[PDB]
Write a protein that binds this ligand. Sequence first.
Ligand SMILES: CC[C@@H]1C(=O)N(C)c2cnc(Nc3ccc(C(=O)N[C@H]4CC[C@H](N5CCN(CC6CC6)CC5)CC4)cc3OC)nc2N1C(C)C
Ligand SMILES: [Cl-]
Length: 112
Amino acid sequence: GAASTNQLQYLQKVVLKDLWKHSFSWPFQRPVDAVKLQLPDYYTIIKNPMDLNTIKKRLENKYYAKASECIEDFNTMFSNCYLYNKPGDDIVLMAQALEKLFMQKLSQMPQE
Ligand SMILES: CC[C@@H]1C(=O)N(C)c2cnc(Nc3ccc(C(=O)N[C@H]4CC[C@H](N5CCN(CC6CC6)CC5)CC4)cc3OC)nc2N1C(C)C
Ligand SMILES: [Cl-]
């Protein structure tokens, strides 16, 4: 159908799916469980938490009106990781590799 429809479909069927399949996706597949991970300060520091499963559900639920809103959530997920953690941390390296894949898939976003 319309370009906007193809774009949101692309984000769900290709971008989200390929990120999930990537070996470094596992920390981003669920919301941070602060009790489990022993991180009382996580939701003190991160006020706009985001994860791939939340994105998945929103795409399934037709929550986003346009592709840009979904891309915002992906970017928020990466930004959260960069903000909370420190340079050189393994989690940051992982996020950077995942983000690179994200950018590559974005570069092929249909416009017609
Ligand atoms: C949230 C910040 C950042 C981030 O930005 N995102 C997005 C993120 C997302 N997801 C994860 N995943 C996990 C990270 C870690 C674990 C783990 O087992 N951690 C264990 C560390 C040792 C703890 N000890 C404490 C005292 N011990 C002693 C016993 C005798 C009392 C026994 C148990 C138990 C918990 C599991 C994960 O998933 C299952 N990490 C993330 N990070 C990491 C840098 C923490
Ligand atoms: Cl794994």
